[PDB]
Amino acid sequence: KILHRLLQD
Amino acid sequence: KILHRLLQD
Amino acid sequence: SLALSLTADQMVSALLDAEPPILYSEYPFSEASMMGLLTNLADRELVHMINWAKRVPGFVDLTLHDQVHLLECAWLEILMIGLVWRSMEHPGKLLFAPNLLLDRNQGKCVEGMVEIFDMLLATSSRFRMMNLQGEEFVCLKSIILLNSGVYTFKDHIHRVLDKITDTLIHLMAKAGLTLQQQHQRLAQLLLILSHIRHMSNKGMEHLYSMKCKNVVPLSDLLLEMLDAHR
Amino acid sequence: SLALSLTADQMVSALLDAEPPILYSEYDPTRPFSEASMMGLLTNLADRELVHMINWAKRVPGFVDLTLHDQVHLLECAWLEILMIGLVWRSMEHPGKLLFAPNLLLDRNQGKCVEGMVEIFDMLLATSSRFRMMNLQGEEFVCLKSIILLNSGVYTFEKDHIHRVLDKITDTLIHLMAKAGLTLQQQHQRLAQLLLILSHIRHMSNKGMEHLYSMKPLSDLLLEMLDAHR
Ligand SMILES: COc1ccc([C@H]2CCCC(=C(c3ccc(O)cc3)c3ccc(O)cc3)C2)cc1
Ligand SMILES: COc1ccc([C@H]2CCCC(=C(c3ccc(O)cc3)c3ccc(O)cc3)C2)cc1
């Protein structure tokens, strides 16, 4: 999940 | 439409 | 008009008196039988809704075309908020009718009905947690009728909308709520209408799909309301 | 939570400072509009806006105190709502026009190039006319947009913390209106009018979403955000 990754950043 | 008839009644 | 002249108490009384009756279902379920009961019930409720709408202060002052547009846009929202309200005293269940009380497991009878069943149940729990009063409910339902299609056309409509807002505040102020608690509760109630709209949209999406048009012969009236949303 | 201790002024300042930038489109004005090209422009623009929206959400008071799964859910549910209200806000000073970008200004006629988009265009324009009629302020806009983020997905799965932040943004809105010289009745009325528009924004998002994941060169992020609504 890209959204979950970008939120992790 | 039927809605017309039910609105005028 | 004559709706703006009414007091905040005369507004509540007019709305409470205009309340439609609670209809009964047609006395385990399959996909066809489940949709059949809901369709039959919804079709009979629509007739009472239309007559309820005319008894809403300021709605008769509207032109026939505008009355049609508002009802075509909000009919499922109005049906759903009514369903949610009836199910308030029945946690985890949906009271479609006094003889038709269903839970989320019975929502699995129809493909794609469970997700919307859960949204309805979540709305009912929210109403219960906020301890929604009947006086507040009739205001919200009237707001849905006047607002949902007002931006797809109206100064009179927004005037009545402000009048119901005044009515809502008056109800909370007469309940012992502080100034902060009043506009906070007002906000909380109106934000739920965004969810009601969502449930209606997602519901409408399935209902006018060809697979749901063919599962059971719908009435011509219910088709016209559905076809209004394409 | 640092959000529950912020004054109304600090809430506004935090939201204003967290505001994402206004991005530009690729759009070469020397070539006429096609259905594929214009959809490409809007898709490419929305994809880059999504990146800024994600980092904007983190700076929204209370959003960082939520779990990652909940953060994903709120954004998946309201991303198009947030994009649209941003568009509507940018287009407020341009009647009959939708300012997707400073170099991309479109009317409803240019919306006909994509089948079924002109319906959404008119709704967006009507919403922009509403903001212009109400004379929506930037301080009010950032409050409404933050509300959408926290409210749109809160009833589809803590929540007590979210509603507490929602109540604070409500206090913030009331504080702004009281500062603008509005009477107590005027504050509650304007608060209602603003929140009722969110119901329409939800509608536009749903109707917009329905067309987008239908029979439509989208980015992987935009695809995942779209597939969240299946
Ligand atoms: C295929 O996916 C589905 C299947 C069923 C629905 C429902 C479930 C929630 C209640 C809804 C309906 C409803 C709502 C309130 C009410 O008193 C009486 C009836 C409904 C509306 C129209 C219709 O032709 C049939 C039912 C709609 C939603 C999606
Ligand atoms: C086929 O029917 C359609 C086609 C396109 C739409 C649009 C038009 C209004 C603006 C919308 C979009 C939009 C919204 C805000 C914004 O800043 C930038 C872009 C959009 C969103 C996602 C996407 O993949 C493409 C565009 C969605 C709506 C319905």
Side-chain angles (χ1 to χ4, degrees), chain A residues 2-4 6-9, chain B, chain C residues 1-5 7-26 28-153 155-158 160-162 164-173 175-230, chain D residues 1 3 5-27 29-68 70-114 116-156 159 161-163 165-214 216-217 219-229:
Chain A
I2 299 183
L3 173 62
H4 187 279
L6 299 187
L7 282 171
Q8 279 186 330
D9 281 88
Chain B
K1 285 179 290 184
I2 310 179
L3 183 55
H4 294 140
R5 182 178 58 84
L6 302 183
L7 275 167
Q8 293 190 355
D9 292 335
Chain C
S1 180
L2 77 164
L4 307 179
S5 302
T7 64
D9 294 275
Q10 288 176 343
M11 178 62 62
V12 174
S13 302
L15 293 180
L16 287 177
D17 186 47
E19 271 296 276
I22 303 182
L23 306 182
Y24 280 78
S25 185
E26 293 183 307
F29 309 111
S30 62
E31 175 173 282
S33 64
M34 172 65 67
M35 290 302 300
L37 294 178
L38 300 183
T39 288
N40 184 276
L41 176 60
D43 175 79
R44 282 178 292 129
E45 286 184 279
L46 282 174
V47 185
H48 290 273
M49 177 196 303
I50 295 164
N51 292 268
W52 155 85
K54 297 182 300 180
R55 299 188 62 177
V56 171
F59 192 83
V60 279
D61 309 319
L62 254 53
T63 68
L64 206 281
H65 170 267
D66 290 17
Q67 292 183 355
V68 171
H69 177 74
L70 290 187
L71 275 174
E72 283 181 351
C73 181
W75 69 271
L76 189 53
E77 292 191 76
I78 297 174
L79 281 183
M80 280 176 171
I81 191 181
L83 167 64
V84 168
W85 168 248
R86 294 191 301 269
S87 309
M88 249 199 61
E89 308 299 87
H90 303 259
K93 297 178 182 300
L94 293 174
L95 201 150
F96 290 91
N99 61 332
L100 191 59
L101 188 62
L102 310 179
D103 67 323
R104 84 175 303 271
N105 263 323
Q106 293 175 278
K108 300 177 180 178
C109 297
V110 183
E111 183 75 15
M113 186 170 65
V114 192
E115 290 74 21
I116 299 166
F117 253 58
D118 291 327
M119 294 191 302
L120 291 169
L121 288 173
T123 308
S124 184
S125 301
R126 177 52 173 169
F127 279 180
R128 206 191 316 106
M129 179 168 53
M130 294 188 59
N131 193 31
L132 184 71
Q133 300 300 127
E135 297 81 356
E136 295 174 319
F137 161 71
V138 295
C139 289
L140 292 179
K141 186 169 60 180
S142 298
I143 286 177
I144 295 178
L145 172 61
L146 300 172
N147 173 74
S148 291
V150 76
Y151 295 148
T152 38
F153 275 138
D155 297 37
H156 167 56
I157 300 182
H158 292 92
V160 183
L161 283 179
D162 293 330
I164 305 182
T165 300
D166 299 332
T167 304
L168 274 176
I169 296 298
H170 176 256
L171 289 171
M172 306 172 186
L177 276 68
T178 68
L179 257 53
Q180 187 182 21
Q181 290 176 328
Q182 287 174 34
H183 61 66
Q184 277 181 356
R185 180 175 181 85
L186 173 65
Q188 294 166 2
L189 289 180
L190 297 179
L191 288 183
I192 305 176
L193 303 186
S194 171
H195 296 264
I196 296 181
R197 172 90 82 171
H198 186 64
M199 295 189 299
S200 176
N201 291 142
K202 308 310 296 176
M204 198 81 64
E205 187 177 10
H206 290 85
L207 291 184
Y208 55 48
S209 65
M210 277 299 181
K211 66 177 304 177
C212 293
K213 290 183 178 301
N214 303 330
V215 64
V216 50
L218 313 180
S219 62
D220 293 333
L221 171 65
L222 188 52
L223 286 178
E224 287 178 342
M225 306 300 292
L226 284 172
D227 293 332
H229 293 253
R230 308 303 180 181
Chain D
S1 178
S5 296
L6 291 175
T7 172
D9 306 88
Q10 283 170 356
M11 175 64 63
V12 173
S13 299
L15 293 185
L16 288 183
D17 187 34
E19 272 294 272
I22 301 182
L23 304 183
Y24 275 81
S25 175
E26 301 148 301
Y27 176 62
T30 55
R31 39 170 147 264
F33 276 135
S34 72
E35 186 175 8
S37 60
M38 187 168 53
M39 277 302 302
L41 295 180
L42 302 182
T43 290
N44 181 273
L45 175 65
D47 169 68
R48 287 178 292 119
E49 286 186 279
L50 278 179
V51 182
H52 289 273
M53 178 193 302
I54 293 171
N55 292 270
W56 158 84
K58 304 179 181 182
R59 298 186 56 179
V60 173
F63 189 84
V64 71
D65 302 326
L66 267 51
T67 71
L68 262 59
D70 295 336
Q71 290 184 3
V72 170
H73 178 72
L74 291 185
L75 279 171
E76 282 180 353
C77 177
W79 68 269
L80 187 52
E81 281 187 85
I82 298 175
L83 280 184
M84 283 180 171
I85 189 179
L87 167 65
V88 168
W89 168 247
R90 296 191 303 269
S91 311
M92 204 185 73
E93 301 291 80
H94 308 266
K97 300 292 184 178
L98 289 180
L99 197 141
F100 294 88
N103 63 330
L104 190 55
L105 194 73
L106 302 176
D107 48 29
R108 66 177 308 273
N109 291 336
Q110 290 170 114
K112 291 190 181 64
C113 300
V114 172
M117 187 177 68
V118 66
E119 281 70 34
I120 287 81
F121 261 51
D122 292 324
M123 288 187 292
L124 292 167
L125 286 174
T127 309
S128 183
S129 300
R130 177 55 174 177
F131 281 174
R132 178 165 54 257
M133 169 165 48
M134 297 185 60
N135 191 20
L136 182 70
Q137 298 298 123
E139 290 79 2
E140 294 175 325
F141 161 70
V142 293
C143 286
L144 288 175
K145 188 170 62 176
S146 296
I147 286 178
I148 294 181
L149 175 62
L150 299 171
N151 176 76
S152 292
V154 72
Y155 293 156
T156 47
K159 303 206 304 177
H161 174 257
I162 297 178
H163 291 101
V165 180
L166 283 174
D167 290 332
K168 260 225 169 295
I169 306 180
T170 297
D171 302 341
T172 304
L173 280 169
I174 292 297
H175 181 260
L176 292 168
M177 302 174 187
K179 189 178 181 179
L182 275 65
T183 70
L184 213 52
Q185 186 185 23
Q186 287 172 335
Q187 295 173 33
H188 299 314
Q189 287 180 358
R190 183 176 180 85
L191 175 63
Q193 296 170 10
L194 288 182
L195 298 179
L196 284 183
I197 300 173
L198 299 190
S199 173
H200 293 262
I201 296 178
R202 171 88 80 160
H203 185 66
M204 294 187 296
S205 179
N206 291 331
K207 305 305 293 182
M209 203 86 64
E210 184 180 7
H211 278 99
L212 288 179
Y213 57 66
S214 65
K216 288 284 111 177
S219 175
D220 294 331
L221 176 60
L222 189 51
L223 276 180
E224 291 183 5
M225 301 296 268
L226 280 175
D227 291 333
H229 298 252

